[PDB]
mmCIF file with all atom_site columns, C-alpha atoms in Angstrom:
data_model
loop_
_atom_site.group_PDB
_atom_site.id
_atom_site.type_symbol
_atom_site.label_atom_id
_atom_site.label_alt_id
_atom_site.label_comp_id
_atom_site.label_asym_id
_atom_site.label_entity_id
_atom_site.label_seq_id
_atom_site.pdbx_PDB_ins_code
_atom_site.Cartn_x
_atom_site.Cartn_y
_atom_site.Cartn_z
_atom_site.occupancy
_atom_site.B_iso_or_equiv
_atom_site.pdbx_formal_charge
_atom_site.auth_seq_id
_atom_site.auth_comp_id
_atom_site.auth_asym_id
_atom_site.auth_atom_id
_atom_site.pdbx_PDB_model_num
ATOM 1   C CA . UNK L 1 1  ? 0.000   0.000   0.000  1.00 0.00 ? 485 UNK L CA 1
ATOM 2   C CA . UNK L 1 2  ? 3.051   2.459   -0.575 1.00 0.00 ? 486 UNK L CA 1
ATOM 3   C CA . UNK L 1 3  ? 3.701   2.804   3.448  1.00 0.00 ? 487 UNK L CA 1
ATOM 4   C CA . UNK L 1 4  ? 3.129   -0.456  5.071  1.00 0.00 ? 488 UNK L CA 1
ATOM 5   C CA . UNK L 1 5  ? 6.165   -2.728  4.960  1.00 0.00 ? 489 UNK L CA 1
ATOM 6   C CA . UNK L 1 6  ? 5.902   -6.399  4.771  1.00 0.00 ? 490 UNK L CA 1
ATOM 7   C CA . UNK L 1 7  ? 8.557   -8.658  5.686  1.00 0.00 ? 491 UNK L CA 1
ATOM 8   C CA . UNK L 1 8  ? 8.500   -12.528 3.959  1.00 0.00 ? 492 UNK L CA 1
ATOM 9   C CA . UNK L 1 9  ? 10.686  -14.663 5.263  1.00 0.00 ? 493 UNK L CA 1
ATOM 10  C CA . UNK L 1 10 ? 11.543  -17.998 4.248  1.00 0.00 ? 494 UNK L CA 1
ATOM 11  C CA . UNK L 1 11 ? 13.861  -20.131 5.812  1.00 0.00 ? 495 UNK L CA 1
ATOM 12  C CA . UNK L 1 12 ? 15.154  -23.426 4.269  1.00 0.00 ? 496 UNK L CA 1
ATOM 13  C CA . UNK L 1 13 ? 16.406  -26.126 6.827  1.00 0.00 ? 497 UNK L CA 1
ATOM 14  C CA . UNK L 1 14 ? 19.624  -28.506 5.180  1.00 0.00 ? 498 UNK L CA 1
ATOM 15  C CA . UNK L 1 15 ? 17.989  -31.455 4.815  1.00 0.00 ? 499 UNK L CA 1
ATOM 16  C CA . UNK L 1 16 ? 16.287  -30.754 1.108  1.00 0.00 ? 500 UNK L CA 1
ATOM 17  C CA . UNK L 1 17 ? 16.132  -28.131 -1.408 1.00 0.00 ? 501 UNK L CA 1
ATOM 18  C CA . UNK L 1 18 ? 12.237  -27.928 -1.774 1.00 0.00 ? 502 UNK L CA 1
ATOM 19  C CA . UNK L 1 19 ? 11.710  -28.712 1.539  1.00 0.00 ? 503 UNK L CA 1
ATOM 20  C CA . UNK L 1 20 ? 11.194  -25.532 3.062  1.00 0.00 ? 504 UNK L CA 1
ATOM 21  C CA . UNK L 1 21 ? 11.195  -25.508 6.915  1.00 0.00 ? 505 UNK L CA 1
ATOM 22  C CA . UNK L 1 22 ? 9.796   -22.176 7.611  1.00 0.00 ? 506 UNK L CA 1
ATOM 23  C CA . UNK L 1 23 ? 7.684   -19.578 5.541  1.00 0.00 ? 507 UNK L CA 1
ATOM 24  C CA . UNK L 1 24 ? 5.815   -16.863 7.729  1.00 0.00 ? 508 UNK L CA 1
ATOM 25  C CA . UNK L 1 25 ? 4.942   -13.572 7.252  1.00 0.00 ? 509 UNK L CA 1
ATOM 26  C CA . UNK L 1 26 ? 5.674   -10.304 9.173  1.00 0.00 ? 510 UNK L CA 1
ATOM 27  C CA . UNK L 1 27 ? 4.005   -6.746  9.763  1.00 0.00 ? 511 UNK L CA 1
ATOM 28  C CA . UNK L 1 28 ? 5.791   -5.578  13.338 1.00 0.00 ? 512 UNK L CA 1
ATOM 29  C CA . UNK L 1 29 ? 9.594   -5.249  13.193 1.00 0.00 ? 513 UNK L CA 1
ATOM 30  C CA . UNK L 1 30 ? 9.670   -6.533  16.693 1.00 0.00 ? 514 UNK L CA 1
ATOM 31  C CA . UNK L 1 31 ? 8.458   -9.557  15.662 1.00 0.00 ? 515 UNK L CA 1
ATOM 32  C CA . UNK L 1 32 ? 10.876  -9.621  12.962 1.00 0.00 ? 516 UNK L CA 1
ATOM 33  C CA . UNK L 1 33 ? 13.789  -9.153  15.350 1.00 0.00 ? 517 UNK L CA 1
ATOM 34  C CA . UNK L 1 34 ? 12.421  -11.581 17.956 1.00 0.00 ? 518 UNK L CA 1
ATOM 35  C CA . UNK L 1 35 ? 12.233  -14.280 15.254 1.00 0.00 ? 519 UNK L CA 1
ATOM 36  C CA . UNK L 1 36 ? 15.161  -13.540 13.394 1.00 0.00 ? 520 UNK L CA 1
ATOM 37  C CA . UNK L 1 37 ? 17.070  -14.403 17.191 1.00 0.00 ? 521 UNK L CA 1
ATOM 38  C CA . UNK L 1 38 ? 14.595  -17.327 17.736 1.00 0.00 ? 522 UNK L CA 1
ATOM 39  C CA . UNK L 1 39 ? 15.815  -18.736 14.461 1.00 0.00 ? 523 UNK L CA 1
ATOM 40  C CA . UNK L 1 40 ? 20.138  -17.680 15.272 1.00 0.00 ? 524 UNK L CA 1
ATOM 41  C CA . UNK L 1 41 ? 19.531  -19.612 18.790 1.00 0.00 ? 525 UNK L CA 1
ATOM 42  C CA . UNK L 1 42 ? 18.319  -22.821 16.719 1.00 0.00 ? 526 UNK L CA 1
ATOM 43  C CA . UNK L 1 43 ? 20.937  -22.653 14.380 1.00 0.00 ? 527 UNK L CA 1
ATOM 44  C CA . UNK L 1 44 ? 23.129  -22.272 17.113 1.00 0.00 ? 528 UNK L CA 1
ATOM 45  C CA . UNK L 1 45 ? 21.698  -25.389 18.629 1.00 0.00 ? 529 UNK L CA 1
ATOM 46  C CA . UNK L 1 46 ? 22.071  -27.158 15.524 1.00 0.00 ? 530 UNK L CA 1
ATOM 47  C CA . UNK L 1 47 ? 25.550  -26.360 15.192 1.00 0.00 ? 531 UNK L CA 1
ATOM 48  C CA . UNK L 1 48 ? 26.110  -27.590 19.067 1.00 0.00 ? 532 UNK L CA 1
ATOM 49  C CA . UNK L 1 49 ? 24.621  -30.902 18.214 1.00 0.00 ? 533 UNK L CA 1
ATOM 50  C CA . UNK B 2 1  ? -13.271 30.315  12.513 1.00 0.00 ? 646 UNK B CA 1
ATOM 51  C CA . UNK B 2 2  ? -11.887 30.411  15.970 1.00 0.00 ? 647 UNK B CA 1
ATOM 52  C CA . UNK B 2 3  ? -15.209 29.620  17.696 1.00 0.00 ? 648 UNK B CA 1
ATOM 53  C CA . UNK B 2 4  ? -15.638 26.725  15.705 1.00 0.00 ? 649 UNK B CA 1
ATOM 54  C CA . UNK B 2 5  ? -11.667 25.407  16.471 1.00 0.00 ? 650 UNK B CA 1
ATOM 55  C CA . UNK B 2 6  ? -12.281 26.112  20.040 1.00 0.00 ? 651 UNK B CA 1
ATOM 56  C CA . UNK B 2 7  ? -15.570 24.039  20.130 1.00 0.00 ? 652 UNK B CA 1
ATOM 57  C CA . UNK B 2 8  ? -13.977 21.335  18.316 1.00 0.00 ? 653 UNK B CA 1
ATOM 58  C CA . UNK B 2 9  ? -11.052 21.155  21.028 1.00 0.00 ? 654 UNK B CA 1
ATOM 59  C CA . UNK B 2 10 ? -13.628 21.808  23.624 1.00 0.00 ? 655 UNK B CA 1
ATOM 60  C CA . UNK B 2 11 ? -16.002 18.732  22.341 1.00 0.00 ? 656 UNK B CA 1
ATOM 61  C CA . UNK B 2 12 ? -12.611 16.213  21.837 1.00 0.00 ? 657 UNK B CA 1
ATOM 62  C CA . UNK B 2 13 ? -11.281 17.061  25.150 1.00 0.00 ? 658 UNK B CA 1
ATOM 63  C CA . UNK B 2 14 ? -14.707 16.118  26.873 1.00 0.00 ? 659 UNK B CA 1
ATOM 64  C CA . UNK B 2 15 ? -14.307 13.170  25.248 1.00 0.00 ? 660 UNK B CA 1
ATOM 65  C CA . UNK B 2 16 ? -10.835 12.499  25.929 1.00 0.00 ? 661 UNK B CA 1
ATOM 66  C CA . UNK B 2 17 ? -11.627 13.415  30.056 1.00 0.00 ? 662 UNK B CA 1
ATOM 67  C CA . UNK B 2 18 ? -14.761 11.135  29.797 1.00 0.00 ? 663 UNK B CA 1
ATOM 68  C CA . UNK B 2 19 ? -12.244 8.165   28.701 1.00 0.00 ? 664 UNK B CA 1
ATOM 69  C CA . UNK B 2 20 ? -9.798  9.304   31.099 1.00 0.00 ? 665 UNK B CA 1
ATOM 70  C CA . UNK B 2 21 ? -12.939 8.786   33.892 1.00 0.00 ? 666 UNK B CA 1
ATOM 71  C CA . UNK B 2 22 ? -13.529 5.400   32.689 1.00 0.00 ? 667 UNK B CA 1
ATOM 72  C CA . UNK B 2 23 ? -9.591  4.872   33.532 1.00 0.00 ? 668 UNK B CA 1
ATOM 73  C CA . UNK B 2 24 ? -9.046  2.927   29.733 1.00 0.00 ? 669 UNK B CA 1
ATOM 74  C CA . UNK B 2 25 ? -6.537  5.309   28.712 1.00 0.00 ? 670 UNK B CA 1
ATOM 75  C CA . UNK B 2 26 ? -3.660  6.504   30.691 1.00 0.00 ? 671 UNK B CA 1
ATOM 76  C CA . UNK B 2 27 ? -2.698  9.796   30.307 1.00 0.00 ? 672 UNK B CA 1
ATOM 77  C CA . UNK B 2 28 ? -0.037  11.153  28.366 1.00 0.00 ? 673 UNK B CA 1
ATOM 78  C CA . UNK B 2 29 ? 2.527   14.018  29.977 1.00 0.00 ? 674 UNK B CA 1
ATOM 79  C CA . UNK B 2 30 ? 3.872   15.096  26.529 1.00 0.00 ? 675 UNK B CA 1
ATOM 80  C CA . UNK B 2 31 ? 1.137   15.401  24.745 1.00 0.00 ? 676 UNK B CA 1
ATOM 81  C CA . UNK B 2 32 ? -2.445  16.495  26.526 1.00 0.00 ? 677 UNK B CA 1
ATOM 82  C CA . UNK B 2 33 ? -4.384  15.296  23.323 1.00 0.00 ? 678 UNK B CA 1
ATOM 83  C CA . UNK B 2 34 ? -2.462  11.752  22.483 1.00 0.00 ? 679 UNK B CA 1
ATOM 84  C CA . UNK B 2 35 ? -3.947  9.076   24.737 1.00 0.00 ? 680 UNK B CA 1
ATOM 85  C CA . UNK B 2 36 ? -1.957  5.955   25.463 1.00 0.00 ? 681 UNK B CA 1
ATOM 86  C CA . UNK B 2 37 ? -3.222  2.265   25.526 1.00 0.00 ? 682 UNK B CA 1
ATOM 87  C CA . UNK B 2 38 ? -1.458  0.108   27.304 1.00 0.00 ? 683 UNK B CA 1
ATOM 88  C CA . UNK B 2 39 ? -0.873  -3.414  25.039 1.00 0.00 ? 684 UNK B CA 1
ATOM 89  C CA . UNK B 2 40 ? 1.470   -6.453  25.150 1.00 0.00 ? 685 UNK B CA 1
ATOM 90  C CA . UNK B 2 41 ? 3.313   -6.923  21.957 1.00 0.00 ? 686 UNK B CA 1
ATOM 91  C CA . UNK B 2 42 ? 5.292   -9.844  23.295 1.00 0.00 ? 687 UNK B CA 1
ATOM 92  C CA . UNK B 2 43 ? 4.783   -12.181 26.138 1.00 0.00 ? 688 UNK B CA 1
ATOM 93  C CA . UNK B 2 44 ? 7.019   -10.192 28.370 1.00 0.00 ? 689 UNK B CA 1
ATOM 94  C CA . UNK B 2 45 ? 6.822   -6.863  26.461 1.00 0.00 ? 690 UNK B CA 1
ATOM 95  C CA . UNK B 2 46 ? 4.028   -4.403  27.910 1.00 0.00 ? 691 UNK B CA 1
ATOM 96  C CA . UNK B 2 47 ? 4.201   -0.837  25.898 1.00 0.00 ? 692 UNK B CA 1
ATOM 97  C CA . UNK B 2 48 ? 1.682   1.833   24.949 1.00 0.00 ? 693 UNK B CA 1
ATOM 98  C CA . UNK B 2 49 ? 0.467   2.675   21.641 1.00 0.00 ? 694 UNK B CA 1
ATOM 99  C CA . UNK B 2 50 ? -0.591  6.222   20.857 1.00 0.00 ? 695 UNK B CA 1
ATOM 100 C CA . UNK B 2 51 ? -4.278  6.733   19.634 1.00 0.00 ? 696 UNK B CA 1
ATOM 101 C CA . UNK B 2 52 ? -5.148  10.206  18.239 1.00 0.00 ? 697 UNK B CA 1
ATOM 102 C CA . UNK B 2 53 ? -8.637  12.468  17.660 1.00 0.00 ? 698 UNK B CA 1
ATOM 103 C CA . UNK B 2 54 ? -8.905  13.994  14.113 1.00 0.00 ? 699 UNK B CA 1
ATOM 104 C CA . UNK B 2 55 ? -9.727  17.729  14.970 1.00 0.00 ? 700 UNK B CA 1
ATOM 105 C CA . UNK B 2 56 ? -11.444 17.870  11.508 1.00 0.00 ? 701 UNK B CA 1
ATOM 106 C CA . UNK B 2 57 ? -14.359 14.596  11.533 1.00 0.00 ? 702 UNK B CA 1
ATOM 107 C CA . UNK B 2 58 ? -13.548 12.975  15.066 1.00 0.00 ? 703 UNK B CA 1
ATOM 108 C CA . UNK B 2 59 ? -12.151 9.524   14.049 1.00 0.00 ? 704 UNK B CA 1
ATOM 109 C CA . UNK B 2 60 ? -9.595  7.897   16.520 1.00 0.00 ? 705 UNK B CA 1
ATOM 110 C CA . UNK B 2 61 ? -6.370  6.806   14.329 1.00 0.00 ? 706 UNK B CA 1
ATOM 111 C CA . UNK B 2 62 ? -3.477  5.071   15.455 1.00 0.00 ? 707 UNK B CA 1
ATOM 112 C CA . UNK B 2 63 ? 0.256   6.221   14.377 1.00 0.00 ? 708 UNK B CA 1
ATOM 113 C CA . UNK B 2 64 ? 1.176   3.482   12.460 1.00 0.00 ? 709 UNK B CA 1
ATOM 114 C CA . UNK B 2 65 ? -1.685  1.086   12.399 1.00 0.00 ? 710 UNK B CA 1
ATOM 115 C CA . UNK B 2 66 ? -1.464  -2.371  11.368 1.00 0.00 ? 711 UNK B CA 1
ATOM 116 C CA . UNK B 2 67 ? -4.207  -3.814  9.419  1.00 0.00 ? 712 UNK B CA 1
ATOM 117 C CA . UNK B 2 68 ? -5.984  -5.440  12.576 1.00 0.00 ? 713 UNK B CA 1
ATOM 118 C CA . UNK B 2 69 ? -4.873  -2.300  13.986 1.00 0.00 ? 714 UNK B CA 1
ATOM 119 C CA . UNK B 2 70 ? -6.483  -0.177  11.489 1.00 0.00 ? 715 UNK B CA 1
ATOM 120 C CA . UNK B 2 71 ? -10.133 -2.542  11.157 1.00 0.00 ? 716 UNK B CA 1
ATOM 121 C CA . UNK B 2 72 ? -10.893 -1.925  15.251 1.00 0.00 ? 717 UNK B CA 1
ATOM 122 C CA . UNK B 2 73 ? -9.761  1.451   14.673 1.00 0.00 ? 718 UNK B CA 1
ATOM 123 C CA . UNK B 2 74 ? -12.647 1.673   12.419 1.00 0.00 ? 719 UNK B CA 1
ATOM 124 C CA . UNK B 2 75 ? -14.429 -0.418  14.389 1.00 0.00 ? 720 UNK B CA 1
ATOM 125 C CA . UNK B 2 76 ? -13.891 2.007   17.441 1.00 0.00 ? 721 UNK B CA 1
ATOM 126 C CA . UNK B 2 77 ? -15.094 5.347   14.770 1.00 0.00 ? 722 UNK B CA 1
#
């Protein structure tokens, strides 16, 4: 709508190329931060295991 | 034109003291015609969002309204 801004964000796990493991959809930039950490602190688990 | 701008102030502050009665609103320091509502974005997080009269038609409007936002918005007008 010109002002709004919308945020897509899709995340693709390792384990296939067309299997997508996340694909959401963001309006608040909070959200987008709080997300963006959730999905650093799996990675970061990932990594640790 | 003045009588009519002080009327409209007059009529949107009675308002705005009549919502401040039914406590729904907290009041805001800076700004005497901005009145906060208190909502959680997060689990944890508990901040105030900034609603705000039109001195022209009297519709409440949010500062940057998202579209749920914006529909009780115009469900509040």
């Amino acid at each position: 709508n010109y002002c709004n801004a919308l945020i897509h964000i899709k995340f693709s796990a390792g384990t296939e190329a067309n299997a997508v493991s996340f694909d959401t959809t963001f309006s608040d930039f909070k959200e987008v931060e709080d997300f963006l950490h959730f999905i650093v602190a799996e990675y970061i688990q990932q990594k640790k295991v | 034109e003045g009588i009519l701008d002080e009327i409209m102030f007059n009529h949107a502050r009675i308002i705005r003291s009549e919502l401040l009665a039914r406590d729904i609103f907290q009041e805001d320091e800076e700004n005497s015609d901005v009145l906060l509502f208190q909502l959680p974005t997060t689990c944890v997080s508990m901040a105030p969002i900034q609603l705000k009269i039109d001195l022209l038609s009297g519709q409440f409007y949010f500062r940057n309204p998202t579209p749920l936002l914006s529909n009780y918005a115009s469900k509040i007008n």
